[PDB]
Amino acid sequence: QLNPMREIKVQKLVLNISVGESGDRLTRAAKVLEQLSGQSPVFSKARYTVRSFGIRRNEKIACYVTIRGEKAMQLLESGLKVKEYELLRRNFSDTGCFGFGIQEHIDLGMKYDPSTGIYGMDFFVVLERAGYRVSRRRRCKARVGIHQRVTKEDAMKWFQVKYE
Amino acid sequence: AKSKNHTAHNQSYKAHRNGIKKPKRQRQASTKGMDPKFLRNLRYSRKHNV
Amino acid sequence: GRRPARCYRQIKNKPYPKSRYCRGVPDPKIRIYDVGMKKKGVDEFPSCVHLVSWEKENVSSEALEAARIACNKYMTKNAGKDAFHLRVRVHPYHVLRINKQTGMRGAFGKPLGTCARVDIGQVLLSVRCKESNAVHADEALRRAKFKFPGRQKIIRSRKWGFTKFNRADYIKYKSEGRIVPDGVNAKLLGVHGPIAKRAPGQAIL
Amino acid sequence: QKTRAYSKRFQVKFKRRRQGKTDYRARLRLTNQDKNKYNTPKYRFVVRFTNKDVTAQIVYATIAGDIVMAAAYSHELPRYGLEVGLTNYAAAYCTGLLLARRVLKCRDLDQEYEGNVEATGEDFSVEPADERRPFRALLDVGLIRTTTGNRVFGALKGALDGGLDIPHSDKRFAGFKKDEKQLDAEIHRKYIYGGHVADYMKSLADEEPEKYQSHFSEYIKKGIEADNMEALYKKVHAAIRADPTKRYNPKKLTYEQRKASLVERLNALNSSA
Amino acid sequence: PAGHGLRSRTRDLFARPFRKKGYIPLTTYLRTYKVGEHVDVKVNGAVHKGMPHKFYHGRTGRVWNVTKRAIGVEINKQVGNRIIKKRIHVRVEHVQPSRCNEEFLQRKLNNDKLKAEAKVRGEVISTKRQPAGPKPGFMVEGTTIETVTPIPYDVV
RNA sequence: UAGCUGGAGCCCAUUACGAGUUCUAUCAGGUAAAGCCAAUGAUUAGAGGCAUUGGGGACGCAACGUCCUCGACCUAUUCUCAAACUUUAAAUAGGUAGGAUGGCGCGGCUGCUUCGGUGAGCCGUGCCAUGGAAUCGGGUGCUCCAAGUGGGCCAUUUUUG
RNA sequence: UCAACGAGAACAGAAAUCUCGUGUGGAACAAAAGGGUAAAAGCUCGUUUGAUUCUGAUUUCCAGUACGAAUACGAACCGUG
RNA sequence: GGAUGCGAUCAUACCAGCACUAAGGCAUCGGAUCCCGUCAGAACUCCGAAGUUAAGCGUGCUUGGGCGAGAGUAGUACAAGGAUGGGUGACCUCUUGGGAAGUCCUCGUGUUGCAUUCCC
RNA sequence: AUCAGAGUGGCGCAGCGGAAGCGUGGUGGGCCCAUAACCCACAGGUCCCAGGAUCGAAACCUGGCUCUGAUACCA
Ligand SMILES: [Mg+2]
Ligand SMILES: [Mg+2]
Ligand SMILES: [Mg+2]
Ligand SMILES: [Mg+2]
Ligand SMILES: [Mg+2]
Ligand SMILES: [Mg+2]
Ligand SMILES: [Mg+2]
Ligand SMILES: [Mg+2]
Ligand SMILES: [Mg+2]
Ligand SMILES: [Mg+2]
Ligand SMILES: [Mg+2]
Ligand SMILES: [Mg+2]
Ligand SMILES: [Mg+2]
Ligand SMILES: [Mg+2]
Ligand SMILES: [Mg+2]
Ligand SMILES: [Mg+2]
């Protein structure tokens, strides 16, 4: 249906960086995402203590922060400008979302005002049609109907006719 | 020779020959162990009858 | 080395099957339960005949494999490897024990072998063949019944091979096309399921 | 997409949980009476907020189902004078005041328990003083989070001022200084008199007059400028304490037409292709 | 003690019935117990407070004490050559009202109205159930009669 | 030491109160069976599809492709099973009730309880209650003192090594 | 809300971190095995010490003794909400 | 014929795929000054009505899964009691009674309490 | 027949969950005319086979295998 309630819109960009290390390495991995987001990030501890990766259990090995709103759009357009407004026709996930990964400094911001190196990073955006609170609220939560679950074909049909 | 013995043989026969003694049904069944909050009140109420 | 099988004949103890508790069990003698062409569909072999035990015992794994080989050598030499399907219908799941100075201090024993618990009128072997050649299979079952401890009948089945179908009723369903051949067995079509899942010519009330 | 064994071994939760409207852990602990009182229900002050109403009910439980004895909705306040913004903190205050007055009048002790005639920010305990103890009800928030400043606790203060005896503490009334661990009487006064809305009406009207118009449409066209909340809630308090009182869905098609359609689909498929 | 704990041998005794696991319906909390009423003790697996020992499951007794959250049940235990009136406390989760006496109470009031009515009219009545007795004789109108015979043995 | 037994009795009694029993009513079970075309586990043999690539031949100038292959996998099946598996679930036995120790009315107490004569219980008083299924019968009903015994064996059924 | 599965995202692969979907428990609950638990009895977070005092009562073993353990009230003092 | 709130019974109520809905109500929804909350006004909290029934909620459909009932399985399996009954034995029979369960076939897919409020 | 003990580099053996070594042996240089010897470097292992718990296993528990050492007496 062409109903003016069924529009796609970003729910959130999640900016994660899998460093698998700690110390000043990951503190700078954090402050860089601070510069990008404007909001304080949260450290993602490890599990499974896989040795061949050189990670201990319950050690902070990643740093992510969730950005949503106009700030999310403003940073997502630069993230796509990295990929020159073209993805691989497979980055899109079956449910509602797509992602890709970049290297930091092709974003906006002078590099060593914090003296932090290039950090690669996986943008991951989740698309939604207005009305997912019926799947996210606390009282009377249920599934959202197929007719207003974004899926792949709508993700492409959102990516290519508009916003590029 | 096996020093350990244990049977329920003959046990019902001994039980039932002086009967299965039921204790006498009593008017004014006993109040021992009932809720003392209730028992205090009942004792006061019997105290102040006319 | 093994004991005589008469010592384990009566069913006297509750089943002791291999499990998280019965460990150390040896592997059984029989390791194959279908011999012949186990691949032909229902319609090649309509003739079915059953070697049916008549008394409760523990036909051991060795006994019941000796039966398959004693029926199979005969049946393959005479009717060729082109015209019979053997299936033993019994599985050695019961585990036997043995207790071999010491008296019966700690008399529970380590397992000895494996045997299968049969029933009154429990089919024990079955073979399926074409009616022209059913004599070889029947007499082969007779040549096998001297490999089992108890006494057995050899009964021709009223069913179509290894199917749950009477002969006339199965062939009638084949006529009206209300039956699907799945291979060794068969399926009715019925009044249940969604219309879409059915073949165009295979939808029935 | 779910297997037969899943469907067959599934156990369905209680319907008021498959619909996700009731917390049974809370409900058992609320309605479980001491067994040595033998019938006396624990009446629950159940306050709920929809997106445009404030339901308030004094209800008690019975095997056949809960039985209401007094209902108060915020959408019936237009009867009393409050027409707009009937889902704010003061609106739930007035809903609680209304429900308390209606319960007290129905149980015939309103004259002996009047509470505060005038609303006060300071937390209120009423005296059971003489021969007739106040009606006692238990707050039943529901599924919501019990945070400071909640409209549930606005309704709570409404009922407490209306004269009910409700188990309460002053640790979640609006204006609780979570650092100093005490209320502010003036701040709670402001909140129960709709001041927290009035200051924001001024906040938009100071230098954001477009969002002000697009945000408070009903206030504007009912002509309530920000300084006219105080006496408006005064008079609604007075009014409340003065008068506390065909086929559009398809039928289930029956057996006859069900298999009438079934034979048609069957002939369609088997004849076709 | 002496070889068995309280909840020995209760693999299938204390388990919930199939698909009746989880929430406890509120009627089990609303049913009120008055001293003298007959309650049947059947344990609930989930509520581990106030459980009776595994013997008292599936028995009936008169209440003797009603407290907050707890019922004093009173049932007869046969040990040796005598009966002990064991007086135990169980939570309401584990007991239900007994319907042994529902029909007796109903027949109580039914008998009383009939004896009052008989007192009003000719003052003779017999308020007793007699067990199923001989049936009286009667005629049967001859219908189509189905002849049945023993069947020949089919070895199939 | 409890049990089983004797002796001394005493208490009452055919009104009642009971019963190694049945009937009516109503609870509780997880054994026999049964089940795997239900979960856990064990397990035989094929049919049809399918992989975002489990691996190979051939085309793959090329892949965001396949024809065979052992086969994962999925689907509907299928032969056989379980004391320490179970949805279902017997028979036999188990518990409780079948009135005079009941019910109702009236006015009194409560230091409990309720928003409250609202309950819960009791107390005094007055009324009713054809004996409230069948059958049978005096009772350990109450108490005391105490003997011996505390090595068992056989049988039918269930049953462990 | 778990285990697991499905589709996904630089380095990143069978396995590191993140997102969404399904998820009757296929996880977790110190340990043995059984039972039980899903807006919890599990995971994280706040606050705490009812792991307190006085003596009785009951259940389990039982001779209907003790001990251990548990359960239900009572009279105090408190924790949390 | 509805809806909301609190619910009772907790699958005939669930699960999967779909088509549809008058007023009202629910809901979606706008915003983030305030109380409040988080990495994130997504959640929660507060304030509010511009729009939309797109979703949820509700109704209905499917030779649907599941579930409930019924016939049937079957007087079969089993099992209390009896036999100086049969049998070498395993087992079985008769006598006095009790009597199951899967597969298969047919039907069904909620009932309802209290307070308020909407219809045409 | 029971009960212990030990299975680790090519051989004999050290090892206390973050986790592998000792001598010697082997591989490549160096000294010598050449081989030792000596000097300097290099590479090691299915931690007996199969499971589980455990942040974390070769160690911890258990099942299976092979060797060795004990105890098998009164008649
Ligand atoms: Mg002895
Ligand atoms: Mg809560
Ligand atoms: Mg002891
Ligand atoms: Mg004992
Ligand atoms: Mg002892
Ligand atoms: Mg059970
Ligand atoms: Mg058992
Ligand atoms: Mg003695
Ligand atoms: Mg069985
Ligand atoms: Mg069954
Ligand atoms: Mg199975
Ligand atoms: Mg009975
Ligand atoms: Mg909780
Ligand atoms: Mg004791
Ligand atoms: Mg060299
Ligand atoms: Mg040299």
Short mmCIF file of C-alpha atoms in Angstrom, two decimals, chain C residues 60-61 119-120 139 155 173 178 180 182 189 192 199 204:
data_model
loop_
_atom_site.label_atom_id
_atom_site.label_comp_id
_atom_site.label_asym_id
_atom_site.label_seq_id
_atom_site.Cartn_x
_atom_site.Cartn_y
_atom_site.Cartn_z
CA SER C 60 20.51 -64.57 20.25
CA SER C 61 22.24 -62.32 17.74
CA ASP C 119 6.89 -62.69 21.55
CA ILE C 120 3.96 -65.05 21.00
CA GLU C 139 11.26 -73.49 1.74
CA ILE C 155 2.71 -68.02 7.31
CA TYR C 173 -6.10 -48.32 -4.65
CA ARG C 178 -5.46 -43.23 -4.63
CA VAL C 180 1.49 -43.30 -3.97
CA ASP C 182 7.16 -44.37 -1.99
CA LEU C 189 -3.87 -40.06 -0.26
CA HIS C 192 -6.42 -34.20 4.96
CA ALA C 199 -0.97 -33.51 -7.46
CA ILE C 204 -9.75 -37.09 -3.04
#
